[PDB]
Amino acid sequence: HTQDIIGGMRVDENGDPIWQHQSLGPDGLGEVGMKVQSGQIYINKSVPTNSADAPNPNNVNVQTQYREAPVIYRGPEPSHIDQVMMSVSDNDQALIKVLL
Amino acid sequence: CKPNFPIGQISENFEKSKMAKKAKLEKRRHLRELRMRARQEKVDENPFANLYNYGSYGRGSYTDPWTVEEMIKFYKALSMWGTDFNLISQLYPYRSRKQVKAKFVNEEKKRPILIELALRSKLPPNFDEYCCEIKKNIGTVADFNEKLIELQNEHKHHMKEIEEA
Amino acid sequence: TLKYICAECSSKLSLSRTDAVRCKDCGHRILLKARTKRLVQFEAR
Amino acid sequence: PVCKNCHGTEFERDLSNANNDLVCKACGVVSEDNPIVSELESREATLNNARRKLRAVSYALHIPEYITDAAFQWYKLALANNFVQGRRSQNVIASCLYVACRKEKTHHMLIDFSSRLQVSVYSIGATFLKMVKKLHITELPLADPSLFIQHFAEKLDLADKKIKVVKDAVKLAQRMSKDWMFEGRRPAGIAGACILLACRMNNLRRTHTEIVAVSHVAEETLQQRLNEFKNTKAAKLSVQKFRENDVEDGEARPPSFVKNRKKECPRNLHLLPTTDTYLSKVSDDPDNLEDVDDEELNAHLLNEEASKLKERIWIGLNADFLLEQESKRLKQ
Amino acid sequence: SGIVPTLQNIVATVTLGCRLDLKTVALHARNAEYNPKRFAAVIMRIREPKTTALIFASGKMVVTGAKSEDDSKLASRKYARIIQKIGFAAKFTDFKIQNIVGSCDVKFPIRLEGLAFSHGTFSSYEPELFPGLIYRMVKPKIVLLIFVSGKIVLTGAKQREEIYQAFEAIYPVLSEFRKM
Amino acid sequence: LSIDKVLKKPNRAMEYDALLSINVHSNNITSGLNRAISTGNWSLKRFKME
Amino acid sequence: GKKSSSSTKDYLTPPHECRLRDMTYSAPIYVDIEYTRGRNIIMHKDVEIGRMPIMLRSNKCILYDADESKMAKLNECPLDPGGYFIVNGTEKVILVQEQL
DNA sequence: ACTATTGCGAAAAAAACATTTATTTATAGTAGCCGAAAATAGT
DNA sequence: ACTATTTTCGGCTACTATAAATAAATGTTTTTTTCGCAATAGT
Ligand SMILES: [Zn+2]
Ligand SMILES: [Zn+2]
């Protein structure tokens, strides 16, 4: 019963964006309206580390387990996003689709 | 415009709702005549027939409410014996061992003075129960105290034949 | 803010996180992000 | 993880020139070059069958598989905790489903299980009670009936304006949440009346059987809710009219103490009656009992000539007193 | 309001040094109830002191149906006075008590889902199968059911004394939720 | 194969209804549809051809 | 497609919507059965057994004979010929096979 | 078809093990079935 | 405007939910082992 979170923009020296994080948006979903260059994570994603552990029927230690698996823009040329959507599948599972 | 049954527009496909609700009142009606008689096929499914609620597939029913004619078969037997549910069960032929117990608890809260009168009654009552004594004894007239002995004597004799063989 | 808008209902929804995926005023289940306020620099060639 | 010159703990994989080397930012010595890419059985058998049974009704009740996968571990721990032995196999796994149904906070009820199982709600619910308390399930979501308003409308097949029947019903449910009707009542019961009233003002879908075929609760208890909600406060204003923009609280009246009025420094240490003084009332003679004597329990005794009369009909009803002689001679 | 919770029913079992025979205790009694396929023992029903007598085939006995504690004690040896009719031992040693139940009324409505969210880490319930909440207690090791009209019935009290301080202890958590 | 497994019971032969057991077996069609269209390979049985 | 009680056309997800959720663009099959329940035999209608996919611009799909306004409401290009499945996202097509 | 050769095949069984067997304490809740009454419409 | 009856309304009657005992069965339950059949297959 552990989901995945889109927390983003870790801050440093009075400013949110890292050189990777100028185009990552307030929600963690990369902000529509601006370009991307190489590097420059545009979709942050964090996954629980107990991905195969058995569910313990209690509440003891689940507060910090999210290791990151971010999505990084490759390519030798700077591009833009076109637009981004989010939806759900046929089963209740979240869908994310961005197109450059 | 009260909220209890207004008719107020198109209301499509209500006839299947109308045909079933009129038909499920007929379910209990044929069950009523079976109860009073005991006192003495191709079918097409419509989806709204089989619908279930929480009152479904569960033990319990509606006991036939008691009559004044049964009261004199109840209070006098409660005057003769203390409280004996075993023989009053067959006295009320299709009534069961359990709701006659529930009736005893019902009469405790309903009439608390009649049951104490039956408790205080420890004596032969007004001598009208002797016909009711033999009304119980006219069914299958046979000795239960003397003739219903030999059957175990016959059956223990059968064991000795098996031990012989 | 100018938060999330529907596809055809086109309704600005600042829907709080990990709560729902649908829209108001419609049963539609595909969501559109609205464009930022921040300026972007371009050339003219 | 540790450099050989600066002993740094931060390593950064450079993909700028497609070499994918590993290097720290402190001194710049590479860490690694030429990356090497990755181009009981009886206990097993009794879960292999139980895997089939979890998959069965999930296909029937349209359960998405991240519950059925999640529910297997709930079955897995109670398999170890000796919860399975003695109880019926079909009964225990359906209780195990509703745990994950509650934790996932779905629209799925509990009688949808038992109707396919063709048992009572109290049969399948009994082992549900012993599951949660024995296996130490403390946190639990509440059965929020607001989910049922959203889910009932689709199989009801109402008009294409199915948003306004729900947006008004959920604002009715928020108004209903403030009202003191459902406090110990049925979650599907009180949620089966707001839809009846929301579609009332727009359509005539209310036939008192179509909603019973959806909500699976009897017709007389929802009409009771129609009379209960009308006569609490300010409902007479919106019986006939008054568009749904009321913002009030009204009086707080759950119907349980309404019946109770129709019927009509801390506490000290030794202020309540004790129990040892009651033990000291009657002498505790272990063999003797002639200190509580009376005259009617002394007369509580047989009618001496009527023991023939008693045993006559006592053995006139014989079936089980007769076969015990038959069985014992067959035991020899 | 310093009300007292009234205690309605006891159960209490006693051993007997004699094995009980079913034949000579039912065929010459008054409140004769013995159907062996229904139940493997005999029950007496007397309305003074409105208790009931449950015996066992092995010899043991349990009394149930008294209002007070000493009310059970005079009942428990009038029951053996009929056992003094038959040539049996009726050797009772220990008057152990293991359930004394009580019902109460505080008579003001309260919220109970607010405490099922607040004190949900230890006590919980199900709304559809039982209309009240089933509450539990660590300190006296007791269970109890609460309602919405203010009535609380106490069950499972092995000791009579234990619920008196327990009912006082559970009073502030109910007045905590004044349904603001 | 599901039916007779119920019908090999004395008690479960009078009140038993078979329309309940439909939906478990109904999944084999649709998953067999979409997999055979996504993966363009067809496992035939009466002709035994791939 | 449709039932026999409602006898409406259908209510169906749009395929341009269905391709944006990686879903199958399919249509349900309804069967009508009779059997021996018990004491009496019983006939039941409109039994769901599955959802078969339908290719677009068929007479069973909602894109049958539009007027560039319903299809404009369904944001679909009228110059698309159609004739292919939208199973679980991707759009594929049966190729016309042959033998001797 | 008689017999031979064999794996299945149901059925015993065994131990465990929770499950009914009846008691009574209430409280509110449905839930079904029933008149009891009372509106209420045909005539 | 009488005759008839269908709402209209409780009334009844029930009945799991409570521990806390007995307690003779009383369900099964998986695990296991057996013992029989017919099945295959040649004689
Ligand atoms: Zn919308
Ligand atoms: Zn280094």
What would the 3-class secondary structure string for G38-74 be? Answer: CCCEEEEEEEEEEEEECCCCCCCCCCCCCCCCHHHHC
Kindly write down the DSSP assignment for every residue of A44-93, as one continuous string. --EEES-SSPPPPSS-SS-S--EEE--EEE-SSS-EE--EEEEEE-SSS-
> Which run of H or of E encompasses B29?
helix B15-39
Q: In CATH, which superfamily holds the domain spanning E12-97?
A: TATA-Binding Protein (3.30.310.10)
State which residues between 113 and 142 of chain E bring their CB within 7 Å of strand H: 131-132
- The integer distance in angstroms from the CA atom of F9 to the C1' atom of H7 is 26
Q: Touching check for D308 and chain B: CB below 8 Å?
A: yes
The tokens describing E26, both together, are 């039912």
CB D222 within 8 A of CB D193: yes
Distance from Cα A30 to the centre of ligand 1, integer Å: 23
Query: Is strand I in 7 Å reach of the CB of D84?
Result: yes
d(CA B98, CA D103): 42
E151-154 contact pairs (CB < 8 A, 24+): E151/E103, E151/E104, E151/E105, E151/E106, E152/E103, E152/E104, E152/E106, E153/E101, E153/E102, E153/E103, E153/E104, E154/E5, E154/E101, E154/E102, E154/E103, E154/E104
Query: Is strand H in 7 Å reach of the CB of E104?
Result: no
C-alpha distances in Å from residue B116, one per residue of B84, B138, D134, D295: 16, 31, 46, 17
Radius of gyration of the CA atoms of chain G, in A? 18
List all nucleotides in chain H with at least one atom under 7 A from a protein Cβ. Answer: 16-35
Q: In the 8-state DSSP scheme, what is residue B92?
A: S
G48·F23 Cβ contact <8 A = yes
Q: Considering only CA atoms, which of B152, B162, E57, B161 is closest in space to residue D325?
A: B152
Least distant ligand from the CA of D4: 2
Q: CB-hemisphere CA count at 13 Å for D131?
A: 26
C-alpha distances in Å from residue A18, one per residue of A12, B104, C39: 8, 84, 18
Kindly write down the DSSP assignment for every residue of E15-75, as one continuous string. --SSPPPSHHHHTT-SS----TTT-SS-EEE-SSS--EEEE-TTS-EEEE--SSHHHHHHH
C-alpha distances in Å from residue A73, one per residue of A23, C42, D269: 11, 20, 75
D3 annotated ligand-binding residue = yes
CB G52 within 8 A of CB G26: yes
C-alpha distances in Å from residue E16, one per residue of D284, E25, E43, F31, G66: 15, 15, 16, 70, 92
Residues D13-51 as b or e (16 or more Cβ within 10 Å = b): eeeeeeeebebbeeeeeebeeeeeeeeeeeeeeeeeebe
CB E144 within 8 A of CB E84: no
F24·D60 Cβ contact <8 A = yes
Neighbour-count burial of D163, counting CB atoms closer than 10 A to its CB (0-12 exposed, 13-18 middle, 19+ buried): middle
Q: Are strands D12-14 and E6-14 parallel, antiparallel or unpaired?
A: unpaired
CB D100 within 8 A of CB D67: yes
Q: Touching check for D57 and chain F: CB below 8 Å?
A: yes
Domain count, chain C: 1
Neighbour-count burial of A57, counting CB atoms closer than 10 A to its CB (0-12 exposed, 13-18 middle, 19+ buried): middle
The tokens describing G76, both together, are 């679909």
d(CA D98, CA D91): 12
Binding residues of C for Zn(2+): 6, 9, 23, 26
The alpha carbon of residue B83 is apart from the nearest alpha carbon of chain D, in Å, by: 12
d(CA E158, CA E140): 10
> Domain E1-11+98-180: which topology?
TATA-Binding Protein (3.30.310)
For tokens 């020296």, name the residue.
Answer: A13
State which residues between 116 and 145 of chain D bring their CB within 7 Å of strand I: 120, 122-123, 125-126, 129
Contacts of B98 (CB under 8 A, 6+ apart): none
Q: How was this structure determined?
A: cryo-EM
CB D229 within 8 A of CB D186: no
Q: Which residue is nearest to nucleotide H34 (CA to C1')?
A: B65
The tokens describing B70, both together, are 């049964």
Q: Touching check for F38 and chain G: CB below 8 Å?
A: yes
- Contact of chains A and F by CB distance (3 or more pairs under 8 angstroms): no
CB D111 within 8 A of CB D216: yes
Task: Give strand pairing partners of G27.
Answer: G52
- The number of beta carbons lying within 10 Å of the beta carbon of residue E75 is 24
Look at the alpha carbons of B79, B83, B87, B91 in this order and tell me if their dihedral is positive or negative: positive
Query: Is strand I in 7 Å reach of the CB of E156?
Result: yes
Helices B129-137 + D307-316 axis angle, to 10:
40
Pseudo-torsion of CA B98, B102, B105, B106, nearest 10°?
-160
Distance from Cα C21 to the centre of ligand 1, integer Å: 11
CB E161 within 8 A of CB D277: no
Look at the alpha carbons of C5, C9, C11, C15 in this order and tell me if their dihedral is positive or negative: negative
Query: Is strand I in 7 Å reach of the CB of E58?
Result: yes
* Chain centroid to CA D9: 51
- The number of beta carbons lying within 10 Å of the beta carbon of residue A41 is 21
Q: Give the SS3 label for residue F46.
A: coil
Pseudo-torsion of CA B101, B102, B107, B108, nearest 10°?
80
C-alpha distances in Å from residue B161, one per residue of B154, B155, D329, D332: 11, 10, 11, 12
Contacts of G71 (CB under 8 A, 6+ apart): G63, G78
Q: Which residues of chain E form CATH 3.30.310.10?
A: 1-11+98-180, 12-97
Query: Is strand I in 7 Å reach of the CB of D38?
Result: no
Q: Considering only CA atoms, which of G78, G62, G85 is closest in space to residue G12?
A: G62
Q: Give the SS3 label for residue G27.
A: strand
d(CA D154, CA D107): 13
How big is the CA angle at G97 (ends G93 and G100), to the nearest 5 degrees?
175
D194 annotated ligand-binding residue = no
A90·G24 Cβ contact <8 A = yes
d(CA D237, CA E11): 55
CB B82 within 8 A of CB E30: yes
The tokens describing E1, both together, are 């309001």
Neighbour-count burial of B138, counting CB atoms closer than 10 A to its CB (0-12 exposed, 13-18 middle, 19+ buried): exposed
Look at the alpha carbons of E91, E95, E101, E102 in this order and tell me if their dihedral is positive or negative: positive
> Which run of H or of E encompasses F23?
helix F22-38
Q: Are strands G41-53 and B42-44 parallel, antiparallel or unpaired?
A: parallel
G23·A89 Cβ contact <8 A = yes
CB D22 within 8 A of CB D13: yes
CB D138 within 8 A of CB E122: yes
Q: Touching check for B43 and chain G: CB below 8 Å?
A: yes
| Closest Cβ opposite residue B86 in set E35, E45, E46 | E35
Closest alpha carbon within chain E to B115: E47
d(CA E62, CA E20): 13
Which residues form the domain of C15?
3-45
Q: CB-hemisphere CA count at 13 Å for A59?
A: 10
Contacts of B42 in chain G (CB under 8 A): 40-41, 43
D101 annotated ligand-binding residue = no
Least distant ligand from the CA of C7: 1
The tokens describing B21, both together, are 């609700």
Query: Is strand H in 7 Å reach of the CB of D90?
Result: no
d(CA G61, CA G14): 10
Least distant ligand from the CA of C29: 1
Q: Which residue is nearest to nucleotide H22 (CA to C1')?
A: E39
Query: Is strand I in 7 Å reach of the CB of D171?
Result: no
Q: Are strands E133-137 and E52-55 parallel, antiparallel or unpaired?
A: unpaired
Closest alpha carbon within chain D to B160: D329
Query: Is strand I in 7 Å reach of the CB of D53?
Result: no
- The integer distance in angstroms from the CA atom of D68 to the C1' atom of H42 is 61
Q: Considering only CA atoms, which of B115, B85, B86, B77 is closest in space to residue B101?
A: B85
Kindly write down the DSSP assignment for every residue of E64-106, as one continuous string. E--SSHHHHHHHHHHHHHHHTTTT--------EEEEEEEE---
CB D185 within 8 A of CB E112: no
Alpha helices in B81-111 (DSSP H): 85-91, 99-110
For tokens 């009321």, name the residue.
Answer: D246
Find residues 66-85 of chain A whose CB sits inside 8 Å of chain G: 85
Q: Which chains touch F (3 or more CB pairs under 8 A)?
A: D, G
CB E167 within 8 A of CB E100: no
E120·D138 Cβ contact <8 A = yes
Distance from Cα C25 to the centre of ligand 1, integer Å: 4
Neighbour-count burial of E71, counting CB atoms closer than 10 A to its CB (0-12 exposed, 13-18 middle, 19+ buried): middle
Distance from Cα F6 to the centre of ligand 1, integer Å: 48
